[PDB]
Amino acid sequence: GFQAEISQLLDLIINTFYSNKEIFLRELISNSSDALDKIRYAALTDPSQLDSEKDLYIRIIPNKEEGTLTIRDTGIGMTKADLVNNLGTIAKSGTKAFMEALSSGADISMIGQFGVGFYSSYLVAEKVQVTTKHNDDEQYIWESAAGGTFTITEDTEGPRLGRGTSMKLFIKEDLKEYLEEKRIREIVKKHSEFISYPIQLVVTKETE
């Protein structure tokens, strides 16, 4: 497909035009919140939809040894067909919409309106590992790196999500401030006041 070129294009453009890198976390939390809204609504008519995971929440897990920041939610998750549609039709179409808004001088502050908000993670990450699990399907993993072509793979080696999506961001070397507890908490409190789901952070005792 065109993930190699799209990821390269959006990596370059997004890092060029969004100097406030901390909005990557706003986009992650907003997308998690939408996925959680989706399973919450589905559970109204089929309560058994929550059998996979009863709790609706967003959890942030930094790993300084690995250099990763993981945002996991217990939202509706993505089927393989959902993920394929994101990588194909949505990425191509939203890149066009984003680039035309960029070109026409239109306001592009809310990048998620173009359907490519996923790529705002390149503000701080050089690679994103997507794990996702929808009630109708198996757990899948897909990796995004600029210029890469990665096949969607059935994830049998990973920890079970139960249900939802986990975005694991491999943070660029100069930007490890985004793994720090106090920095994460300021950003969430600034950019996610109106989120109606618990936002959790794993804090680890430090040596020393």
Residue 117 labeled ligand binder? yes
Of the residues 17, 34, 55, 106, which one makes contact with ligand W8V according to CB under 6 A:
34
Q: How far apart are CA 15 and CA 11, in angstroms?
A: 6
Question: Count residues contacting ligand W8V (CB under 6 A)?
Answer: 20
Instruction: Say whether residue 91 binds ligand W8V (CB under 6 A).
Output: yes
Interacting residues with ligand W8V between 14 and 33 (CB under 6 A): 28, 31-32
Q: How far apart are CA 162 and CA 54, in angstroms?
A: 10
Of the residues 77, 133, 141, 145, which one makes contact with ligand W8V according to CB under 6 A:
77
In the complex, minimum distance from the CB of residue 7 to ligand W8V, in angstroms, rounded to a whole number: 9
Residue 116 labeled ligand binder? yes
The SS3 of residue 128 is: strand
The gap from C-alpha 156 to its chain's centroid, in whole angstroms, comes to: 21
Residue 190 labeled ligand binder? no
Nearest to 57 by CA among 207, 190, 203, 199: 199
Q: How far apart are CA 37 and CA 43, in angstroms?
A: 10
Instruction: Say whether residue 38 binds ligand W8V (CB under 6 A).
Output: yes
Q: Which stretch binds ligand W8V (CB under 6 A): 83-91, 103-111, 172-180, 189-197?
A: 83-91
Of the residues 95, 139, 165, 192, which one makes contact with ligand W8V according to CB under 6 A:
165
C-alpha distances out from residue 24 to 20, 30, 129, 178, 203, Å: 9, 10, 15, 10, 20
C-alpha distances out from residue 106 to 100, 109, 176, 198, Å: 8, 9, 32, 34
Residue 93 labeled ligand binder? yes
Give the burial string for 128-161 (b: 16+ CB within 10 Å, else e): bbbbbbbbebebbbbebbbeeebebeebeeeeeb
Residue 88 labeled ligand binder? no
Residue 165 labeled ligand binder? yes
Instruction: Say whether residue 10 binds ligand W8V (CB under 6 A).
Output: no
Binding residues for ligand W8V, rule: CB under 6 A, are: 28, 31-32, 34-35, 38, 73, 75-78, 86-87, 90-91, 118, 130, 132, 165, 167
Q: Which residues are annotated as a binding site?
A: 27, 31, 73, 78, 86, 92-94, 113-118, 165
